[PDB]
Design an enzyme around this catalytic site. Sequence first.
Site, PDB file in Angstrom:
ATOM      1  N   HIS I  61       3.099   2.093  11.496  1.00 19.28           N
ATOM      2  CA  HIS I  61       3.619   3.190  10.202  1.00 19.28           C
ATOM      3  C   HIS I  61       2.807   2.097   8.529  1.00 19.28           C
ATOM      4  CE1 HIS I  61       6.232   3.968   6.427  1.00 19.28           C
ATOM      5  NE2 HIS I  61       6.638   3.174   6.937  1.00 19.28           N
ATOM      6  N   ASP I  91     -23.852   2.912 -11.588  1.00 13.70           N
ATOM      7  CA  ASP I  91     -23.678   2.544  -9.622  1.00 13.70           C
ATOM      8  C   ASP I  91     -22.701   1.454  -9.637  1.00 13.70           C
ATOM      9  OD1 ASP I  91     -23.063   3.204  -6.702  1.00 13.70           O
ATOM     10  OD2 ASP I  91     -23.557   5.434  -7.239  1.00 13.70           O
ATOM     11  N   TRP I 126       4.673  -5.321  11.212  1.00 17.95           N
ATOM     12  CA  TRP I 126       3.181  -5.840  10.776  1.00 17.95           C
ATOM     13  C   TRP I 126       2.522  -7.100  10.404  1.00 17.95           C
ATOM     14  CZ3 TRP I 126       0.893  -6.776   5.738  1.00 17.95           C
ATOM     15  CH2 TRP I 126       1.816  -6.903   5.188  1.00 17.95           C
ATOM     16  N   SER I 156     -14.382  -5.437   5.278  1.00 15.92           N
ATOM     17  CA  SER I 156     -14.337  -3.832   4.610  1.00 15.92           C
ATOM     18  C   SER I 156     -13.745  -3.469   3.408  1.00 15.92           C
ATOM     19  CB  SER I 156     -13.935  -3.013   5.080  1.00 15.92           C
ATOM     20  OG  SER I 156     -14.307  -1.298   3.893  1.00 15.92           O
ATOM     21  N   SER I 157     -12.761  -4.866   3.401  1.00 14.56           N
ATOM     22  CA  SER I 157     -11.848  -4.731   1.257  1.00 14.56           C
ATOM     23  C   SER I 157     -12.657  -6.479   0.699  1.00 14.56           C
ATOM     24  CB  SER I 157     -11.024  -5.320   1.998  1.00 14.56           C
ATOM     25  OG  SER I 157      -9.976  -4.518   1.795  1.00 14.56           O
ATOM     26  N   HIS I 240       1.522 -12.614   0.325  1.00 13.84           N
ATOM     27  CA  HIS I 240       2.322 -12.105  -0.644  1.00 13.84           C
ATOM     28  C   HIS I 240       1.357 -11.526  -2.346  1.00 13.84           C
ATOM     29  CE1 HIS I 240       5.548 -11.108  -3.523  1.00 13.84           C
ATOM     30  NE2 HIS I 240       4.080 -11.515  -4.942  1.00 13.84           N
ATOM     31  N   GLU I 242      -1.194  -9.621  -0.841  1.00 20.70           N
ATOM     32  CA  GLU I 242      -0.885  -8.308  -0.314  1.00 20.70           C
ATOM     33  C   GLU I 242      -0.414  -7.571  -1.340  1.00 20.70           C
ATOM     34  OE1 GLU I 242      -2.775  -4.933   1.440  1.00 20.70           O
ATOM     35  OE2 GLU I 242      -3.821  -6.580   0.892  1.00 20.70           O
ATOM     36  N   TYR I 244       1.013  -7.382  -4.461  1.00 17.93           N
ATOM     37  CA  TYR I 244       0.066  -7.706  -5.537  1.00 17.93           C
ATOM     38  C   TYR I 244      -1.040  -6.932  -5.671  1.00 17.93           C
ATOM     39  CZ  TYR I 244       4.592 -10.371  -7.083  1.00 17.93           C
ATOM     40  OH  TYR I 244       5.643 -10.849  -6.925  1.00 17.93           O
ATOM     41  N   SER I 255      -1.280   2.529 -16.635  1.00 12.56           N
ATOM     42  CA  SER I 255      -1.404   2.293 -18.178  1.00 12.56           C
ATOM     43  C   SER I 255      -2.717   2.811 -18.896  1.00 12.56           C
ATOM     44  CB  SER I 255      -2.197   0.538 -18.211  1.00 12.56           C
ATOM     45  OG  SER I 255      -1.265  -0.171 -17.994  1.00 12.56           O
ATOM     46  N   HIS I 290       8.505 -17.576   0.036  1.00 14.22           N
ATOM     47  CA  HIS I 290      10.762 -16.464  -0.575  1.00 14.22           C
ATOM     48  C   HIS I 290      10.089 -15.573   1.206  1.00 14.22           C
ATOM     49  CE1 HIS I 290       7.748 -13.689  -3.370  1.00 14.22           C
ATOM     50  NE2 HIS I 290       7.903 -13.226  -2.024  1.00 14.22           N
ATOM     51  N   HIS I 291       9.366 -15.328   1.918  1.00 16.07           N
ATOM     52  CA  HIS I 291       9.479 -14.726   2.986  1.00 16.07           C
ATOM     53  C   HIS I 291       9.906 -15.344   4.161  1.00 16.07           C
ATOM     54  CE1 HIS I 291       7.131 -11.046   1.359  1.00 16.07           C
ATOM     55  NE2 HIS I 291       6.516 -12.078   0.712  1.00 16.07           N
ATOM     56  N   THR I 316       5.650  -9.161 -15.817  1.00 10.69           N
ATOM     57  CA  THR I 316       6.128  -7.983 -15.735  1.00 10.69           C
ATOM     58  C   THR I 316       7.000  -7.239 -16.052  1.00 10.69           C
ATOM     59  OG1 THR I 316       5.918  -7.868 -13.367  1.00 10.69           O
ATOM     60  CG2 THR I 316       6.389  -6.547 -13.307  1.00 10.69           C
ATOM     61  N   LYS I 319       4.542  -5.812 -19.409  1.00 13.02           N
ATOM     62  CA  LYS I 319       3.966  -4.875 -18.526  1.00 13.02           C
ATOM     63  C   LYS I 319       4.505  -3.593 -18.878  1.00 13.02           C
ATOM     64  CE  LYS I 319       0.850  -4.036 -16.238  1.00 13.02           C
ATOM     65  NZ  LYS I 319      -0.452  -4.047 -16.953  1.00 13.02           N
ATOM     66  N   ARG I 438      17.023  -5.191   9.779  1.00 14.24           N
ATOM     67  CA  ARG I 438      15.501  -3.526   9.895  1.00 14.24           C
ATOM     68  C   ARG I 438      14.658  -3.895  10.854  1.00 14.24           C
ATOM     69  NH1 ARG I 438      11.362  -7.036   5.918  1.00 14.24           N
ATOM     70  NH2 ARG I 438       9.675  -5.682   7.337  1.00 14.24           N
TER      71      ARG I 438
END
Lengths: 144, 105, 46, 84, 49, 98, 43, 73, 514, 259, 227, 79, 58
Positions: I61, I91, I126, I156-157, I240, I242, I244, I255, I290-291, I316, I319, I438
Amino acid sequence: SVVKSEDYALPSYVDRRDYPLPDVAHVKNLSASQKALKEKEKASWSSLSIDEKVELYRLKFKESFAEMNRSTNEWKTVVGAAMFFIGFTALLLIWEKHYVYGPIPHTFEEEWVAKQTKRMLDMKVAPIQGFSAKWDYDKNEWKK
Amino acid sequence: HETDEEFDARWVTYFNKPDIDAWELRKGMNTLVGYDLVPEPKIIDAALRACRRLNDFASAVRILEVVKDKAGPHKEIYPYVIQELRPTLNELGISTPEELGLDKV
Amino acid sequence: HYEEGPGKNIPFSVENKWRLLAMMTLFFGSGFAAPFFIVRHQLLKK
Amino acid sequence: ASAAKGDHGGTGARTWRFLTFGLALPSVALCTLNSWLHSGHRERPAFIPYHHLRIRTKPFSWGDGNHTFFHNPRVNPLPTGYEK
Amino acid sequence: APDFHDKYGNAVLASGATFCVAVWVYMATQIGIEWNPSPVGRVTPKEWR
Amino acid sequence: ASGGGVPTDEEQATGLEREVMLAARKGQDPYNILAPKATSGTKEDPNLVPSITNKRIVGCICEEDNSTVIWFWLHKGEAQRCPSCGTHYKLVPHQLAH
Amino acid sequence: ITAKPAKTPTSPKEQAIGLSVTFLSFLLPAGWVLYHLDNYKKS
Amino acid sequence: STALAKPQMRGLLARRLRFHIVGAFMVSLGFATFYKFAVAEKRKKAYADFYRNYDSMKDFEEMRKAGIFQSAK
Amino acid sequence: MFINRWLFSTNHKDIGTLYLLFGAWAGMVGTALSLLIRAELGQPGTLLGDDQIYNVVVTAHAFVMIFFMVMPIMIGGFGNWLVPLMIGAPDMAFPRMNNMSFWLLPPSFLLLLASSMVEAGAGTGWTVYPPLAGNLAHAGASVDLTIFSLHLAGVSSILGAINFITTIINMKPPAMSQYQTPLFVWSVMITAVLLLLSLPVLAAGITMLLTDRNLNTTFFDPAGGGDPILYQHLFWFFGHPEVYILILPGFGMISHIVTYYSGKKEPFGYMGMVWAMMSIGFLGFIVWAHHMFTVGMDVDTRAYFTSATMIIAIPTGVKVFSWLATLHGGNIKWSPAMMWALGFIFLFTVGGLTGIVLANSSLDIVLHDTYYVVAHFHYVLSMGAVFAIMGGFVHWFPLFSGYTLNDTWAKIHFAIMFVGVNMTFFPQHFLGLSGMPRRYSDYPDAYTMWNTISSMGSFISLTAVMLMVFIIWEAFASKREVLTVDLTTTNLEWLNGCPPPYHTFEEPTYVNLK
Amino acid sequence: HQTHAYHMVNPSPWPLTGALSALLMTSGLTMWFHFNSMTLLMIGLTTNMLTMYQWWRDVIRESTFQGHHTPAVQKGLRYGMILFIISEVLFFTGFFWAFYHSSLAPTPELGGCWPPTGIHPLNPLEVPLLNTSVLLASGVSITWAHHSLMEGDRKHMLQALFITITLGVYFTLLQASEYYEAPFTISDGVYGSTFFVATGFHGLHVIIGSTFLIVCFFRQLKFHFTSNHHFGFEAAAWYWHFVDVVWLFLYVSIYWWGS
Amino acid sequence: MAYPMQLGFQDATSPIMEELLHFHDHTLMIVFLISSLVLYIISLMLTTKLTHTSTMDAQEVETIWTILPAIILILIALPSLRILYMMDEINNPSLTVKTMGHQWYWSYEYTDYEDLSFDSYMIPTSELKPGELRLLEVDNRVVLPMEMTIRMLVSSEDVLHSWAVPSLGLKTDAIPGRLNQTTLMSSRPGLYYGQCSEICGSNHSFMPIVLELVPLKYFEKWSASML
Amino acid sequence: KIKNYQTAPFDSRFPNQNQTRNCWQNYLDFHRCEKAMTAKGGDVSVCEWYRRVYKSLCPISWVSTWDDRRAEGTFPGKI
Amino acid sequence: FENRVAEKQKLFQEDNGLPVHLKGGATDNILYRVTMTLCLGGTLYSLYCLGWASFPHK
Ligand SMILES: CCCCCCCCCCCCCCCCCC(=O)OCC(COC(=O)CCCCCCCCCCCCCCCCC)OC(=O)CCCCCCCCCCCCCCCCC
Ligand code: HEA
Ligand SMILES: CCCCC/C=C\C/C=C\C/C=C/C/C=C\CCCC(=O)O[C@H](COC(=O)CCCCCCCCCCCCCCCCC)COP(=O)(O)OCCN
Ligand SMILES: CCCCCC/C=C/CCCCCCCCCC(=O)O[C@H](COC(=O)CCCCCCCCCCCCCCC)COP(=O)(O)OC[C@@H](O)CO
Ligand SMILES: CCCCCCCCCCO[C@@H]1O[C@H](CO)[C@@H](O[C@H]2O[C@H](CO)[C@@H](O)[C@H](O)[C@@H]2O)[C@@H](O)[C@H]1O
Ligand code: CUA
Ligand SMILES: [Cu+2]
Ligand SMILES: [Mg+2]
Ligand code: NA
Ligand SMILES: [Zn+2]
């Protein structure tokens, strides 16, 4: 009057309270009376009648501020339809309870729960606020 | 920036330009209603007279609607302004949106 | 050249709305059904 | 640093060729002599079956599963010791 | 000239709300779901040992 | 110590790369590599916007350092004004490759 | 935004049809699997 | 007839904003106060009052006699 | 013709179409896995009778929703369609590489589906931590197939990030500085620099897990002198950034949508919004542990990670406040995209705030590995991302298709989704504070009521997902063609019409210097 | 007809074949590690190589032969190669991180020391020093190559580039010989793991960079480069300096400090 | 343990846990206030026909909205780091107990004096005695002396696990090859439960922890009888 | 003689959460000392403190694997 | 060697509508057909292998 796809690159008409004088007139091709009305507009506006004034407004603009700003009943259709689909979801959950889920564990039986509840109060689970704190150990009853 | 008085005079002068063109009349009103204020009668007076020199009755009425719209829920402001413009409305034969039935939805 | 224009800049046909309904049903329904079937497959292996 | 040499009037092809043959390749020649001079097989150490070495948690995907990819029988013992 | 909302809005609101309330009340109370609410003020504790 | 045999771009550049090189030589910019410089932008001295067709998009940065750029189609004909600052622009169509 | 009127209007009846087939297409295959879970669980 | 007095015409959005940001500040103060008394002090006082005369051996003896422990009967 | 166009593309709009379709089909896979999770939990006891399967469904998931739904839609889909049009470019810089980043995704997805079909799946989380993901506790091909799926998705990324950085830096009109580019194009530039530097570290880490499983290395095996905690550092050093990367292009879209439907020509405080995104992307590299506040960390290191993590609230907050100051004074149009953006602003703030509670390592000891962490990220990630995605999609669908949606039906979809996600995730906070772990397939009986309500919530969002598929059908079925669109003077991507021609800006825009 | 300077590329099949070669390589490594078979992996390596060859052949057709690399196109390619090399630096950084994590706090299974009990490291002053001199030397010759090209000297560009390639090959043979002679292996705990995975991936990049300079060598033999336009040679030189820099950090960290 | 419909934390069993409850109340007040302020401002932004759409100046307001959030963070950080360092301060324990995770049960070692160790498994639901708690009871509880600082060392013999007892504010990962240390002190006798908190495979949900806190002399005798 | 042991005290050499090296150092000290004593014909009694400390801290399986590897001759620390 | 780039420039700029990957002639088509046969046939073979690996072989 007809707006075409192939006109996208040209200034267009919009009724917006915050852009009150749009880039083009609402009516671009005038009838012969409309044209003579435009001629009449070059003389004193006190000589124009009310109907002619209204007609000069309507050649320039599509909707008045009162019209473009009006409220609608759409909220009734939105809220009602959202309730209907939320109600439909409960049909799905009735089908799943009936056909997918089996029995829950025997620890949920009334007699188990009564005994388990006594045993929580015997071990004074959450005695300061959460659970045993709500039991009156002198009167042997839940606190009122 | 500037005083209220200075701001208002600048806008009076903009609309009082004798040969102001139709592009300038629209640019002016569409810029002016971006600001946090309902324009003073003197400014509205000058823009309605620009409409007269440009032969444009329809834009004069729409300018009155936009003064009303800019006042939002402050319902005392639009009648005050129309009161103030009444000698102008009379002199130029400008009917108000209400007199034309364009306030009804 | 290539076709341009609404309905033409996409790799599926929208020329008929019922045939489109069937293609969309199979497309999104196959994504949605897949994990149910992969769980069935793993429960069936033991 | 400045090295201990000098040039800088121009760092062109003539200068970098001069460095290639006057310093870079002489260096490689000297190191090649230093290496091929401390070459010669050294005496292999006694085998001790330490559990942090010769790790086998899955067989290798080649050979008999138990030889590393560039296995050298002279100096690489198996988990059970040096090969015959 | 009446749009869809002028003609059907009140009906959609009224029936959608009635239907939604009815079917959730039925699901919550008639089909054997065990919510397991707090015993506090509801369960008489019983000897267990 | 030194010799030749490597081609130069003058000799061997081809296609669009050669076109840009030869245009730059003549100080021209048919492929829009440079930012055009503004005129005063009045009705008498409008910004002149070349196009190979009858309309071109203009972005107007009305004041230096604005981060908002204002975008509009400029069509062949009478000069048009930026809808934000009023500066004038006039399309000058046509041509390229002779 | 403004747009033309639809080139191929989709009437209320046609929408009920599109919505119902869209809903069955997600509900039926998952429903089938889950209905039969116990036939899998001890199969 | 009576002329209408001139109203405030300028800055009406800013005015409304300042009024309600002040209002939201006052309400925030109200809530902090309510919360410190309904929740935070309430908690400090529950714990303090529980432990003030708490007798851990007595609690243990009641638990032992109810039969809860493996190590104590 | 068809194959040249859709399999050999070198066009940014078509490739962006492909990524939207891919991501939509992924989102159905992801949503069905989420419904399986919550059906297992919807009443006490076992549903699937096989918790190894329940762990595989939870692991899949998250990878599907993160790597196959959010990133492809936001950066492959909206990035490719919008960034060239917003800067007037003809392009992307590398139009044929751009097509390989799209095509690596179906194979990466097939590998992940292969991982769940072979053996007993990868029931690892994951995060794929060893030793559970190692070759004794997960023997067999499934974890290796997951590792390769992530390798193909990383390449790819990383290639997409090189293409977007180059396009954005090199392909603007010669007069437009970086501080004249729209906020969505900045949000994409900054996400791409995070991808470029974070993905290679996760590729290093998972390649070491692959060699520990197949080549007898021992980076993470204490028997050879390795350490399982080294994996967690390299995973989270990527992980981390990832999170953001998942939200930044959502902040860009938001925006634009809030500016547009407030009838404004520009967002409030543009350079503050640029600064805030660059600050969040920079601080997003120095907070990852912090993880790991419960792995046995020194107190001074906990102190530093708690304080550096909280600092992110400052940019943050600028914004969030700036979006509110952009609505301030607007002529508000209550279109369905506006609803999705206003829902984003409130639900993202809730989730960001529960993130600040978790940043406090002393509270995180109790909250780590409980449903309070799940409630955090389903508010800020699942809802913030999904609501910016839905708002983007309903906003720009007439640009990409040339057709309009029914706005009433889109409002209805919004309302149902808003109820569903809040019913599903809000009670998870109570579950977390009261200590439910969890990654469990069943719970002590006291946790029944919140689980029961959260699972009923999940069905409400399912009804919304089905509805949305019908709403897209009805738009394509009816064929209401776009005629006019407002505010094109400050929304360049709409000025070439709907849909724009295959080649746009063949003649570039003219922009003067002055 | 466009009037900007950027390159609209012809529709191409190489992205799809490269994506499928990726699925076959990874499917194929799975088959090799678990189903005892090299078949899929060999088809994927073959398709990967055909894809790279045709794709980069076509970039050469586009630029040298068709003239599509204007200065704007070439500047975009410079940025693309710099950002690629930054991504490869971050990949090696994961391996250096694993190295320092394991060697700075050696666990009790190792004997609580570094190098672990039972590991006899190579002497960094022997072949590893030679390999260092060889790569630094090749950084000096590729700079000679670059200046000869800018100065329009065909024969000396060819000789300096040949010398640079010969050095890359010599480093590769040296490292192959060191791997065979080494008394420790990749299965020798975290010492073998960090040493062979970090130097093995470096060795792989030495092979890739050498292959890239060999392509530049054959392009120069066919006169593709001009004295001012030769980005594939610049990209190959920036990549080769990357490989040299990574080696200097490996030598200092793993071979010298970690001995 | 948790109880049905609980919204917040389990009542605190250790004085660190009471600290965390007060710190959470302070942080949650700030979280409610901010979220409710943003929701309020949103409603305020959206409820007026008044407009102002011209360019707005942002440097005055960006001061308030960076300095005020910085002050609120410092007001969370200060009590936050006080707790963190307080928990860390030198304790002197009177007892050390080790726990080792396994798939899927825990073992315990109390080897300061004798060699005592045993395994502790979940009671299967079908074997629960009346009134006992489904998924939480074990066969062999971790008996410990109340009112005493105990050092727990945690590790694993296979994959990761994590040893947690929420009422005591405890969670320490169990990592093979590592010995993580945490301290525990219960203010009260009783039974305190927790559950494994790092996913460790198919029975992660089914390996709970139960501490049984009793006076020292009961703990001494129980220890003797478990040899 | 200097006893009343309850458990291993705080050791400022190992002040943090990972105590692996504390267990290991006291195991090594014990066996080094016992080696020193048994050799130089003294008495193992003086090694007691390290014995009590590593018994209290080290997992039984660690101690038992390390004793096996000393018997086997594959223990990697120096004793 | 002699510089024959100008010949190649003429070849690849021939106005024949061919995409660059086939503009060198028949040999391009054959290489393209080899590559695509191997990719598509390999992909079908990897699906077969998944089918095979999806089930226990006991
Ligand atoms: C879904 C079912 C929910 C069941 C509700 C509670 C049951 C009561 C039992 C019976 C009541 C009896 C009294 C027993 C007191 C227990 C005290 C305690 O130990 O206390 C600890 C408790 C305190 O919890 C509470 O004191 C309950 C208050 C719930 C929070 C307020 C929002 C109300 C939400 C609406 C319903 C949920 C869906 C919508 C939420 C939308 C997103 C937040 O636990 C929490 O930490 C939960 C909050 C998690 C933190 C996230 C905060 C973000 C703010 C949310 C939006 C607010 C602004 C908009 C204002 C609200 C506008 C919408
Ligand atoms: C969109 C994705 C996303 C985003 C943006 C965030 C944003 C943040 N997250 Fe996280 N997070 C996740 C996705 C995300 N997160 C995921 C997926 C996990 C779990 C991974 C796993 O284990 O599977 C997670 C886990 C996670 C943890 C680990 C918890 C644990 O495992 O024990 C922590 C710990 O600090 C954390 C904190 C934060 C913080 C402080 C932010 C901050 O960036 C939030 C900033 C926002 C605000 C604070 C709200 C807006 C601000 C204002 C209105 C101004 C005023 C505010 C204040 C003064 C406080 N997050
Ligand atoms: C002279 C330097 C040349 C290096 C290349 C040589 C060998 C084969 C080809 C591939 C190169 C790949 C790079 C590194 C990968 C892992 C280990 C390789 C380094 C190496 O060659 O190590 C050899 C072990 O090789 C082994 O296992 C070999 C195992 C070969 C299988 C490689 C496995 C494939 C796994 C790689 C997955 C790659 C993922 C890439 C991520 C891309 C980013 C997304 C060491 O030999 P040994 O006998 O243990 O000790 C010597 C004792 N005398
Ligand atoms: C046993 C051997 C097999 C080994 C396995 C891997 C394979 C080896 C690949 C070696 C890489 C070869 C790259 C050749 C690129 C040739 C095309 C080229 O160089 O193209 C140039 C553009 O550069 C460009 O695209 C720049 C394009 C740069 C590409 C850089 C590629 C690096 C590839 C790395 C891939 C592996 C990743 C690492 C694993 C972790 C063309 O422009 P110019 O040069 O200016 O010419 C124009 C002038 O003539 C005009 O006058
Ligand atoms: C999480 C997503 C899931 C959401 C809830 C799904 C809602 C269910 C939709 C209905 O699905 C079906 O319902 C059946 C029964 O109601 C099934 O018939 C079964 O039931 C019968 C009657 O008992 C038989 O007639 C048939 O053989 C048959 O297999 C069945 O195949 C199935 O497609
Ligand atoms: Cu043991 Cu989870
Ligand atoms: Cu994080
Ligand atoms: Mg954890
Ligand atoms: Na369950
Ligand atoms: Zn302008």
